[PDB]
Amino acid sequence: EKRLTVGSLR
Amino acid sequence: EKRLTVGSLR
Amino acid sequence: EKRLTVGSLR
Amino acid sequence: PDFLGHAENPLREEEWARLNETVIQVARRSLVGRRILDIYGPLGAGVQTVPYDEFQGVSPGAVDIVGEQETAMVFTDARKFKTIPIIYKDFLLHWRDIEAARTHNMPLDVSAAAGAAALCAQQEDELIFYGDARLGYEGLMTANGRLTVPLGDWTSPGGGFQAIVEATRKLNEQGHFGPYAVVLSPRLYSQLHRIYEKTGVLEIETIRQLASDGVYQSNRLRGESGVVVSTGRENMDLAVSMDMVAAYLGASRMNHPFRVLEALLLRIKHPDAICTL
Amino acid sequence: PDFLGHAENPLREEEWARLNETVIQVARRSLVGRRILDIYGPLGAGVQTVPYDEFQGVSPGAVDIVGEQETAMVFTDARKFKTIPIIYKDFLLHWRDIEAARTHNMPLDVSAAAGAAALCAQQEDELIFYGDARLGYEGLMTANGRLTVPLGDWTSPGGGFQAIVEATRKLNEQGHFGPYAVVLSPRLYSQLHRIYEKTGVLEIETIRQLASDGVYQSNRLRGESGVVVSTGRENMDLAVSMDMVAAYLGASRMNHPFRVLEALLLRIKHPDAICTL
Amino acid sequence: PDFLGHAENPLREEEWARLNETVIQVARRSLVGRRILDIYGPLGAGVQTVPYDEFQGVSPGAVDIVGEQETAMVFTDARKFKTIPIIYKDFLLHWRDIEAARTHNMPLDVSAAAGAAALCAQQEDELIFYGDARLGYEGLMTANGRLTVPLGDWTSPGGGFQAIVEATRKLNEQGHFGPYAVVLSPRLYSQLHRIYEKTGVLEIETIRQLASDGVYQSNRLRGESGVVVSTGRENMDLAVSMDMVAAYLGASRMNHPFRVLEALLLRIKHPDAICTL
């Protein structure tokens, strides 16, 4: 599956 | 689903 | 076996 | 009683089949560019953009005993994309006519559907031959860097033959070969049925000798116009997302609206495989 | 995944097949010299050298009651050999296009391969018609034991017929009478498309009867130039070790480069079976 | 044995995991724009185009007991599609280091990977704050339609407060309220922390109290520059097809090259939710 690695920093 | 109706004339 | 591709055009 | 409420589909299988067959039959008679252009396979309604590659710049190859001489690679000058439009036309049906067709057992009238399917094909051919300045599209007669030969004296016998000879010469010198195709305006197409070769053969046949893919006429072309192209998928193509089809727009005031629509675009990879008169 | 590593093969079998068919079709549509030259049997990629026999003068047969005459050619005191070169051109494919074709079934586009194949075919024709000074090869227009005849004026009709009969007479005076073939530049080929008043037909049709093996045009020829050759395996041929094919070059910068290549050489055994205008 | 030939994948799972963890940690400690922007979502590597919509103006809305009052809908003024670029950096590893790590049973050394991840993050921030001007991208400091306020003295105390208050009132007069964010250049950021005589209160504290979404410093801003934005996914966002990752480029002189890369774009839907100084 597709995923985020760094992601949101909010 | 993906199909031609008028089709190709060549 | 060795074969031609484009081939002879004569 | 079926008209006393909202519906998902107002017609039955036979009526829908009749309407679709009418649309297809009308389109096939009037479509012209599909006779000289190849089709980039049906992508689907979900696809809205396609890459638009161009190969204006190129370099020659190499000859070597070991294969270490270096030449540039063949690739797009600049990678860009373009969005596919929609061409459509609407029509309306009255519910009492559908009632009088289901009862009394008479055929249903589909002349409005035929007219919509004709007006859609006319717009498709107009988009193929001329572009769209608002949306930034180009056609075969407006592409930039496309090659042009003067029409000359078409009135004298052999006048069209000389122009086509010059055009095919220019295409050959630019490096495109193989079967050619010619599209002409209706006035030129009609005035080209004359005598020239002293053997009784007509100029149109002598020109068909040079143009092995066909000579056609189109009503979209203006007065004193013509185009000759080097055919082939590697020079130009037609990318279609969905072919011509009819859809129901939902009831309004008990009457039924429908729409005939399609989605396609023209890609010119080699603008120098064309020549205009 | 599958783009985060270094692979042996980036494409599937159907894509390889489509690529090869595209290359073959473009080559067959673009090649010229293979229509006038015979092919010495295909040797194999391991073969890199072939004999280069050169014959001079005219030696005829014999008619007599008891066969006590020699009538045999002798081998050259040298018997030189020559090396077969490689002709190739490269193209590129982006990895995100392959990713799209495998995730959302969008068809693969191989127009860069067609461009590379066209350029390789043009390189082969250039090597056939002219030579290669650095590699020491000779072409049909640069041979040393070749005959020559003045072109003359072709602005007026009949000039083409006069030059081709003179060339055939000069070839006649050296013991070559076989069916002839003519290759011209686009200026001469286009100028041969007028009506000759002495005959009432197109001037090209008389030359097509004179030659009977073919009249062709090539854009490799420069300015106003032409060649008449006497055909046959005993005068000239083409020795090919590997026909046009495509090969993966290994990934670089995450993208995929490919090469289209072939290996062939032209052998001129009788240099007086040619005549240049 | 393994290092004596070309390889598809030179690392094991644990080494890959350590590499990716290092990249993630460095990027998380270095990124600035991802702090103030929202994320659309992981679209996929095969997706290369994204819709680019713009909204102008605001309509109020309605209050009614049956709900028959009419209000305009929310859609788009002009739909465009844009292409997603790639941001990347490269580093190298020595093969004897991998061998040493597997023999001593110690973690692999990834200092070059960390150094590359930092530079990739810096390039992403440069793309976010300024566009490209070759590829047709705009940033928060170059967007047309943006609002502007004159920068004051900023030496005497109060100037920064006046500038931020003016910017917020200007943004409010266009229907753009909400938590505000401020980004400043290092010179301005340092000037805010000054202690003059009798000071009593610093200015950065009041600015932080009036911002409520953050005051940040970025070294990519040039000279004396600053920006105030009204945050929210209804005014701006960041579209990402692939998040920061590492890939192998294939060996060279026995040593192993790698790339750190990502693919994203900035979408500005309300150009008037920004204000530059």
Side-chain angles (χ1 to χ4, degrees):
Chain A
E1 278 66 89
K2 324 190 269 291
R3 291 129 74 61
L4 291 189
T5 66
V6 165
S8 191
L9 301 176
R10 289 216 71 186
Chain B
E1 43 283 66
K2 301 191 262 187
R3 277 313 208 231
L4 293 180
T5 70
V6 157
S8 202
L9 307 179
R10 254 162 85 69
Chain C
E1 286 65 13
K2 326 170 188 177
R3 302 175 57 180
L4 292 174
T5 67
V6 170
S8 188
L9 296 191
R10 266 175 72 84
Chain D
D2 309 79
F3 44 82
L4 305 173
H6 231 228
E8 162 129 350
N9 188 234
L11 306 182
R12 301 146 145 188
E13 299 236 302
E14 322 98 41
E15 298 155 299
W16 210 221
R18 178 153 137 120
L19 205 140
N20 284 314
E21 295 163 355
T22 291
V23 173
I24 284 146
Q25 163 244 154
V26 170
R28 291 183 159 163
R29 263 193 290 81
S30 34
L31 275 185
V32 154
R34 290 216 201 181
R35 275 178 243 276
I36 72 154
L37 274 157
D38 296 87
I39 282 170
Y40 183 34
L43 310 167
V47 181
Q48 308 176 238
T49 45
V50 285
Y52 201 95
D53 293 334
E54 301 182 63
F55 300 96
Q56 298 222 15
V58 278
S59 63
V63 50
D64 184 8
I65 305 179
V66 292
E68 303 295 347
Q69 184 178 2
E70 184 65 13
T71 51
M73 276 211 266
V74 170
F75 196 72
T76 325
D77 314 316
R79 177 86 146 189
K80 316 174 325 153
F81 286 67
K82 264 185 176 62
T83 185
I84 296 138
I86 302 168
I87 304 102
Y88 59 97
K89 190 47 156 93
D90 305 334
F91 65 96
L92 193 68
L93 287 199
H94 190 255
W95 62 278
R96 281 202 290 179
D97 304 12
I98 292 141
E99 213 34 63
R102 304 219 170 122
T103 71
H104 307 173
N105 165 133
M106 41 189 123
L108 188 72
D109 192 13
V110 292
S111 90
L119 281 186
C120 216
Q122 227 61 49
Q123 199 41 86
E124 156 175 2
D125 263 358
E126 171 82 7
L127 185 62
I128 278 168
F129 281 106
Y130 301 82
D132 196 311
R134 151 185 164 241
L135 299 190
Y137 297 131
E138 256 161 345
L140 295 176
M141 326 270 315
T142 61
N144 212 45
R146 65 178 185 263
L147 257 68
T148 287
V149 285
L151 199 80
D153 302 67
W154 208 268
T155 70
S156 240
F161 188 70
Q162 292 318 116
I164 308 273
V165 158
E166 276 339 288
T168 44
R169 159 182 90 55
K170 245 163 216 208
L171 270 174
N172 211 90
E173 289 179 328
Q174 288 292 127
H176 296 277
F177 324 118
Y180 296 113
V182 185
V183 176
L184 291 168
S185 86
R187 144 169 299 290
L188 269 54
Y189 189 88
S190 62
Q191 70 160 297
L192 273 192
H193 292 253
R194 31 185 201 196
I195 281 166
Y196 168 60
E197 267 193 323
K198 233 158 298 292
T199 75
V201 178
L202 307 150
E203 216 165 331
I204 194 67
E205 279 303 324
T206 306
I207 292 174
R208 287 196 167 107
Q209 228 61 60
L210 291 185
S212 151
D213 252 357
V215 187
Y216 311 87
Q217 53 157 337
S218 154
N219 262 272
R220 306 279 68 193
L221 256 31
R222 326 249 164 101
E224 316 307 78
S225 318
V227 63
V228 48
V229 300
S230 184
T231 53
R233 156 186 337 274
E234 58 272 3
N235 310 297
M236 44 192 93
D237 84 298
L238 210 59
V240 313
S241 347
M242 53 144 41
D243 223 341
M244 226 161 159
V245 80
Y248 182 44
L249 301 191
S252 163
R253 300 207 199 75
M254 290 171 93
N255 291 328
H256 313 269
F258 301 80
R259 147 174 314 175
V260 170
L261 72 150
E262 67 175 350
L264 45 84
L265 190 54
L266 164 83
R267 320 196 285 168
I268 308 162
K269 299 137 196 194
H270 281 271
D272 57 327
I274 310 161
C275 195
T276 50
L277 306 152
Chain E
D2 219 43
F3 41 80
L4 303 175
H6 202 251
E8 293 177 350
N9 182 6
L11 301 179
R12 295 170 293 182
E13 271 229 326
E14 317 79 71
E15 322 179 288
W16 267 118
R18 282 189 41 224
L19 182 64
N20 278 319
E21 304 169 1
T22 311
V23 158
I24 283 160
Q25 163 245 325
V26 172
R28 293 192 173 154
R29 170 190 191 161
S30 303
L31 280 179
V32 171
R34 268 183 222 216
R35 290 189 230 271
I36 74 151
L37 286 149
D38 263 298
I39 285 174
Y40 169 38
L43 315 165
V47 187
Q48 312 176 48
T49 308
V50 278
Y52 203 86
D53 296 320
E54 283 257 320
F55 314 95
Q56 172 59 10
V58 180
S59 60
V63 201
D64 79 328
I65 304 308
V66 289
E68 304 297 313
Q69 306 207 231
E70 281 314 324
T71 89
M73 89 282 204
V74 84
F75 258 127
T76 289
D77 37 40
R79 170 102 152 161
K80 344 190 280 193
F81 283 65
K82 266 189 178 35
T83 319
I84 301 140
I86 301 181
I87 318 100
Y88 57 87
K89 190 52 158 145
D90 299 288
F91 69 91
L92 191 60
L93 287 188
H94 192 266
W95 61 275
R96 280 196 289 178
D97 314 353
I98 303 184
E99 246 288 327
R102 222 147 287 184
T103 60
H104 66 86
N105 301 1
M106 186 174 60
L108 203 43
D109 200 50
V110 289
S111 306
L119 278 163
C120 181
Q122 150 178 320
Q123 204 44 54
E124 169 191 317
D125 264 5
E126 172 82 28
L127 172 75
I128 286 173
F129 280 104
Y130 298 82
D132 202 338
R134 109 178 157 98
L135 291 209
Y137 298 128
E138 284 212 304
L140 288 185
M141 317 285 312
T142 63
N144 272 1
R146 79 190 147 93
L147 308 174
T148 65
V149 56
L151 187 73
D153 180 34
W154 291 36
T155 38
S156 52
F161 200 64
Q162 299 193 46
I164 310 287
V165 303
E166 224 304 325
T168 42
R169 151 161 64 270
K170 278 209 162 103
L171 269 151
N172 252 299
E173 280 146 23
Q174 315 275 346
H176 292 113
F177 330 91
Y180 305 101
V182 179
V183 176
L184 301 147
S185 81
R187 173 97 72 87
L188 295 197
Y189 196 82
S190 81
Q191 291 204 276
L192 282 185
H193 274 85
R194 298 201 290 290
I195 275 158
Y196 195 13
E197 52 82 64
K198 211 150 253 283
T199 313
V201 300
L202 288 185
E203 196 171 10
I204 181 89
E205 322 221 53
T206 329
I207 293 141
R208 290 211 153 119
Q209 293 300 328
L210 221 39
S212 99
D213 230 316
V215 185
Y216 307 91
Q217 55 168 338
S218 187
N219 67 320
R220 304 285 66 193
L221 266 39
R222 300 143 198 207
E224 296 156 339
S225 307
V227 67
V228 193
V229 309
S230 199
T231 69
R233 289 191 173 265
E234 53 275 358
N235 308 89
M236 47 201 90
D237 69 349
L238 231 46
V240 6
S241 8
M242 195 192 18
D243 228 344
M244 245 188 235
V245 81
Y248 184 40
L249 285 183
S252 153
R253 296 181 196 99
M254 260 171 120
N255 279 331
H256 309 271
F258 293 83
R259 192 177 263 190
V260 306
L261 74 146
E262 54 172 11
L264 60 91
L265 178 78
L266 159 85
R267 305 202 287 189
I268 300 148
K269 336 189 173 165
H270 277 256
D272 46 354
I274 302 158
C275 194
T276 69
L277 321 159
Chain F
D2 47 304
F3 43 94
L4 289 182
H6 236 228
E8 271 236 26
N9 173 26
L11 296 183
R12 323 178 148 170
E13 334 178 359
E14 322 86 58
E15 303 154 351
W16 270 121
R18 172 160 171 83
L19 204 53
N20 287 311
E21 268 131 41
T22 307
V23 180
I24 290 159
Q25 161 176 339
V26 176
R28 279 193 184 149
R29 298 209 335 131
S30 327
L31 276 176
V32 174
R34 278 196 206 211
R35 253 177 254 289
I36 67 148
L37 293 157
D38 307 65
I39 306 301
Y40 175 6
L43 309 175
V47 174
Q48 318 177 44
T49 36
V50 84
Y52 201 94
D53 295 0
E54 177 202 64
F55 312 82
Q56 339 188 318
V58 281
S59 274
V63 164
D64 200 47
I65 300 171
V66 287
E68 297 297 316
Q69 202 177 336
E70 205 77 314
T71 40
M73 286 197 182
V74 172
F75 186 43
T76 175
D77 284 77
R79 158 148 305 189
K80 271 55 177 168
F81 286 69
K82 281 191 176 183
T83 55
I84 292 135
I86 299 180
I87 305 90
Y88 58 90
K89 185 75 210 213
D90 293 338
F91 69 94
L92 182 82
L93 296 184
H94 184 72
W95 54 284
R96 288 204 292 171
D97 298 355
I98 291 116
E99 287 306 316
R102 298 178 180 176
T103 266
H104 297 170
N105 226 287
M106 59 168 149
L108 183 81
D109 200 23
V110 287
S111 316
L119 291 164
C120 184
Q122 281 285 276
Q123 208 58 31
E124 180 202 300
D125 273 346
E126 176 78 31
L127 182 61
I128 291 182
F129 279 104
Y130 301 83
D132 207 280
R134 207 161 20 81
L135 304 155
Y137 299 129
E138 253 164 23
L140 302 182
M141 318 287 309
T142 51
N144 280 211
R146 101 185 77 102
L147 304 164
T148 62
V149 145
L151 191 124
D153 183 11
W154 278 63
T155 317
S156 214
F161 194 82
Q162 303 326 323
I164 309 300
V165 164
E166 206 29 71
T168 46
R169 150 185 155 306
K170 261 214 186 110
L171 283 160
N172 211 52
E173 310 168 335
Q174 320 270 319
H176 285 299
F177 70 104
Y180 294 116
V182 172
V183 182
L184 289 179
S185 79
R187 198 176 198 160
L188 286 198
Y189 196 78
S190 72
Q191 200 50 27
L192 244 30
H193 293 72
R194 278 272 56 201
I195 278 177
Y196 311 91
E197 48 71 39
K198 98 194 155 84
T199 310
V201 200
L202 295 174
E203 276 215 53
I204 187 65
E205 256 329 281
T206 85
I207 299 315
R208 225 164 238 135
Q209 256 168 296
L210 267 181
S212 174
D213 228 309
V215 175
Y216 308 89
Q217 159 201 231
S218 179
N219 64 302
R220 323 267 19 175
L221 297 193
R222 308 162 190 163
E224 321 229 42
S225 36
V227 76
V228 187
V229 313
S230 312
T231 61
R233 40 179 322 173
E234 73 268 8
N235 314 118
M236 26 196 68
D237 85 323
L238 212 71
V240 177
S241 26
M242 201 184 55
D243 220 2
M244 230 182 247
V245 77
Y248 189 41
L249 300 171
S252 175
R253 307 185 274 182
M254 279 193 294
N255 283 332
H256 301 288
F258 297 85
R259 186 172 272 190
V260 162
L261 81 154
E262 59 173 2
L264 44 88
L265 177 66
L266 165 76
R267 306 200 297 177
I268 299 161
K269 323 161 172 183
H270 263 274
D272 62 322
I274 305 162
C275 197
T276 53
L277 322 158

